[PDB]
Curated annotation (Swiss-Prot), chains A, B:
Superkingdom in the source lineage: Eukaryota
Disulphide-bonded residues: none
Tissue: Ubiquitously expressed. Expressed in skin endothelial cells, alveolar type 2 pneumocytes, bronchial epithelium and alveolar macrophages.
Positions of 2',3'-cUAMP binding: Y16, R87, T112
Residues that hold 2',3'-cGAMP according to the record: S11, Y16, R87, T112
Residue(s) carrying Phosphoserine: S90
Protein name: Stimulator of interferon genes protein
Binding residues annotated for 3',3'-c-di-GMP, in chain numbering: S11, Y16, R87, V88, Y89, S90, T112
Functional description taken from the UniProt entry: Facilitator of innate immune signaling that acts as a sensor of cytosolic DNA from bacteria and viruses and promotes the production of type I interferon (IFN-alpha and IFN-beta). Innate immune response is triggered in response to non-CpG double-stranded DNA from viruses and bacteria delivered to the cytoplasm. Acts by binding cyclic dinucleotides: recognizes and binds cyclic di-GMP (c-di-GMP), a second messenger produced by bacteria, cyclic UMP-AMP (2',3'-cUAMP), and cyclic GMP-AMP (cGAMP), a messenger produced by CGAS in response to DNA virus in the cytosol. (Microbial infection) Antiviral activity is antagonized by oncoproteins, such as papillomavirus (HPV) protein E7 and adenovirus early E1A protein. Such oncoproteins prevent the ability to sense cytosolic DNA.
Result when mutating F2A: Partially constitutively active mutant that promotes the production of type I interferon in absence of cGAMP ligand
Phenotype for G7 to S/V: Partially constitutively active mutant that promotes the production of type I interferon in absence of cGAMP ligand
Effect of V4M: In SAVI; constitutively active mutant that promotes the production of type I interferon in absence of cGAMP ligand
Outcome (variant: Y89S): Strong decrease in c-di-GMP-binding
Amino acid sequence: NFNVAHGLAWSYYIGYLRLILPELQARIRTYNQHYNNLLRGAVSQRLYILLPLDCGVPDNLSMADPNIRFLDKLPQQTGDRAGIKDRVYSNSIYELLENGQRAGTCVLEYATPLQTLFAMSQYSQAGFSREDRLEQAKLFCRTLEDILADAPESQNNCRLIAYQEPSFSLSQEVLRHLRQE
Amino acid sequence: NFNVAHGLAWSYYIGYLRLILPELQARIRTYNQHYNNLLRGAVSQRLYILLPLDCGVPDNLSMADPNIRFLDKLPQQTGDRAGIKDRVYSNSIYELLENGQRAGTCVLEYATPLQTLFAMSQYSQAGFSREDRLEQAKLFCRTLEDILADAPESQNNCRLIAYQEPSFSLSQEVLRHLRQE
Ligand SMILES: Nc1nc(=O)c2ncn([C@@H]3O[C@@H]4COP(=O)(O)O[C@H]5[C@@H](O)[C@H](n6cnc7c(N)ncnc76)O[C@@H]5COP(=O)(O)O[C@@H]3[C@@H]4O)c2[nH]1
């Protein structure tokens, strides 16, 4: 089912990343100037996107790792979309703790289409096996990396974080990408 | 690319319809009791979903047909999703005019994945032809109809309106489904 992940990666770019990435740095700048706690470090630029290859996507990031704690929302982005007046795109800011201290602050989320791969593997009517799932997750990631490599909307404002579990620290994994910038 | 539309229909159910359909009638009832103009007819039950087979999805419904006019928003539905705190799902209410008079009122929108099919057909990197597009749109609709036929979340709260253009009246097409209930 090569075309499953292919379609989902295109949909994630077309219906989301291409719409929010151009306005993201402006939203982060607005937050850093007008809303961020005066005493804290600036929110990093770039949207950090988590890509668990096992497609396990909890809705609360603190459930994946206690060292990842919700801080605040960015200013919302709204726009008329497919007949929906003022559809809302929102993103959450997280602090990343290391040794109990805040080590980084960034806009962070899971890639939601991985939830579709997971659920399709669980619904009999989808005809999608658990083995198909890992292969489709990798293909989703590869397709997305290839799109963003060529996309004009991606201008050092997006970082993909793919990982697998076999102890693994998600916060440390995000900190490693953060510290690379 | 059978699997393209297959994936997109599953994603539309998993990541949207299964999440909003269970709460929709409660939201419509809330609107009809607390927000609707006292002098107007009740907002119809059911989400009406437009499926233009040519995948032409304008963002403003008035552009497709002047007799479809935005009225109001339903109360928003929010929830934590894939690391996004309080992700917002919103829906718009439209009046449908006939002979200048309001003939119906309903929650109405286009199926957004049809936008992905359209854009994939325009981007060279997607490897998706314009001919592939019509066939995938039909397959998207058939797959979605089959999912919703078996879905426990769909309890006479969703109506799919598929159509093609070869004069065609969108408002009349929606009124025909409305008057069937
Ligand atoms: N993290 C995240 N935040 C968002 O606001 C968002 N919006 C879309 N997406 C994802 O991007 C891709 C393309 O979006 P599209 O609109 O074409 O399809 C969407 C859309 O048709 C519908 N849907 C989801 N939320 C809404 C909504 N608030 N209003 C209308 N439709 C919605 O159901 C499909 C799947 O939604 P998601 O399962 O969240 O994943 C989508 C998809 O992978 C999002 N991902």
